[PDB]
């Protein structure tokens, strides 16, 4: 009748965009980088072990100053570490012990938290009283919070388990914009360096690029076969990598609107949990479920050194703003700070 | 009623040939799980494992003494140090197993209560008490009544008389009997009383819980390993100490045979601990 | 936030007193407390400091063994015990709050203070000028100098600049020579090179008047500056 | 019917997406090599910094 021809038109359009992507791919990125010198073996040492948590760590986020990191754990405590000296600057007690994400504001004044309570609480560190209290409990999500990031001190874009990402206004408390179009639970987002764009990975094995001001999905890069456990941006903002649960990482391109390279190897069969990029973008660090954290060259797809000493699943990962250090937080309540040296 | 000096050499290096391979991996097996997470069972396995290694290096020093028909060819300064190296683990191993079996009974009889005090810091303190109380106890009996000590005023060294060359092999039976008996009643038998009580406590609780046919089967053996070590390796050695008390005229060859079994704890202790 | 102190009066030398500092409007238990005295027509002087949770205790060498500072968390009141008084101990004693962590602003708030009238190595801090005639609308530079370099290996040089309004408790202006305290106008600016310490005021207004005190915070005992006074 | 409006917004989305200035894959690859070569010396991980400069040490 009417829905049948509409679905036929949709299938024809999908075929059209697929063949356009195939035609615009004259070659692949693997052959182009067959002459560039390899990054070689990379060794990273456990410079610090931010012990103090009493339960599994589920997220972390580096501050703008590349010194303070906030971590969230099932103990219900939002701890802000001084990674230079391993000092616990703040120990924020969460209202709900179940937290799946946290964030550090670019200004450093506010930190975020959220989880199974579907509330993306925001705490104000810099207060006259001297302690830390929740400022605005953002509510309105139907599902659990997955990963929430702040565009500015008033605008925060979030991701829930209700197939919809949202952009919030801290001052008012209502969703300025609501992002819809995903048919599965969304697990993580990744803000662009220039803040104009942001992508999100969902449970339908599809990563969609959205616009903060447009309010609608722009591109729906789709090459994965399983849920994207986390997404991340290239330093220049022209590409991103989507992690996934089928033990492979894919580096998509914004302009090409297609997969550029696939990161996988036979002996790894554990899905990627977190993904982050180095400052130069050459090294793609991913936190796997086999207690390791592999470091792949983003232009070669060869494993270059692993940060194997963590004893449990790496649940979170983060690279500093200046790229000086890489921090991973596992389920054994240990945050380890790493960097490269000879 | 026979013990050739060569046979004692053969049996002693047999413990050396078997205890050494097992003990290094026993600590390696213990230190493998120690890095991951520390639990009270790890501490009692590490302390027993470390004290096992301390005894293992003592056997070659004792083995050569066996060939010498009791003589002490090694320097006389080593014998007081060798006394700690050999006799202390014989009593330190007995204490830890009682502490280890005390944890098993607490773990199974009152599982909810034991989760509250799961911290290894409590385990280290009890080990520290065994670390000190054992060291103090032979420390006191060495300063007071050992030859060349407080009671014995002689040119003989603090830990060794030399009638014909002996490392505490000629301690007079008049004072050693009551002296060793204090080792037996305090450092072995009361730990044996704790282990025997704590072993029947585990079996009572193990049956009540639901297991895949492991309630009184797989568990019985491993929980019985601690008691098996005490009654088989350290038992016959320390049974001779109390034998010389009530039977001061009993021949010393039985103690010599007992020392082999007491020194045999190097081999079987890592086997029944189950951390290999 | 507010700190109220009581226990002032005329006391014969050699007697005993009790100074009580009441804390209200903030989390007392998480704030370290200092006690600062100010001799009449003189500069401020450190007395004692007590850490959060009574963990660590410091006293000045002048009053060591005589004066003791004690916090009380459940009643939200700090207490300075007082005994073996002498004619040099008559001063305006201030209760001072300070919280210590990365990026914190210690010495941010000062109590009103009580008047005390008694009847009848350490870093030496020097300021070249004591009275600077000035008119509004220009730029003023205040010179502070230290015996030893305050810059540390961590990269933090511990400066603290204070403004004491006439008949008012001193107010924190700049900490660590570069971070502007909350509630302070943007016109204030500071700089330093490890030996030459300066404070700059971009433009002047009636409120800019006051005695300026520069601080070192590398190590205890705490020491105050000579005191640069601004007058119109 | 909300299906027709959703389809209209979707087709408008691909229509506005299609008209974008797309360059060759080789050009993007060359830009990537330039970015990772100019900033190679400035990356603490690709080129390790001296231990004196390394803040964590
Ligand atoms: C009356 C009895 C119970 C008091 C015993 C106190 C003493 C002997 C105990 C209490 C705490 C113990 C310490 C606790 C932790 C450790 C770390 C471990 O890697 C080596 C031993 C060491 C350093 C212990 C040494 C012995 C110790 C100091
Ligand atoms: C060898 C490793 C040593 C490490 C440090 C430990 C010990 C420190 C010193 C403690 C003093 C000990 C003295 C007594 C030693 C043993 C006496 C044994 C007598 C047993 C009597 C018998 O059955 O014949």
Residue numbers in the entry:
A (entry chain B): 2 to 343
B (entry chain R): 1 to 165, 169 to 279
C (entry chain N): 2 to 121, 137 to 248
D (entry chain G): 6 to 62
What does the primary publication say about this deposited structure?
However, FFA1 and FFA4 are activated by long-chain fatty acids, while FFA2 and FFA3 respond to short-chain fatty acids generated by intestinal microbiota. FFA1, FFA2, and FFA4 are potential drug targets for metabolic and inflammatory conditions. Here, we determined the active structures of FFA1 and FFA4 bound to docosahexaenoic acid, FFA4 bound to the synthetic agonist TUG-891, and butyrate-bound FFA2, each complexed with an engineered heterotrimeric Gq protein (miniGq), by cryo–electron microscopy.
To investigate whether FFA1 uses a distinct mechanism to recognize DHA, we sought to obtain a cryo-EM structure of miniGq-coupled FFA1 bound to DHA. We further performed local refinement focusing on the receptor to improve this density, which allowed us to model the part of DHA from C1 to C8 together with the carboxylate group in site 1. In our structural model, the carboxylate group of DHA forms salt bridges with R1835.39 and R2587.35, while the carbon chain from C1 to C8 forms hydrophobic and π-π interactions with surrounding residues F873.33, L1384.57, F1424.61, W174ECL2, and L1865.42 of FFA1. The carboxylate group of DHA forms hydrogen bonds with two tyrosine residues Y442.42 and Y114ICL2, while the carbon chain forms hydrophobic interactions with hydrophobic residues from TM3 to TM5 of FFA1. We also observed a hydrogen bond between DHA and Y243 from the α5 of mini-Gαq, which is the major receptor interaction site in mini-Gαq. However, Y114A exhibited near wild-type expression level but significantly reduced DHA potency in arrestin-3 recruitment assays, indicating that Y114 is important for ligand function.
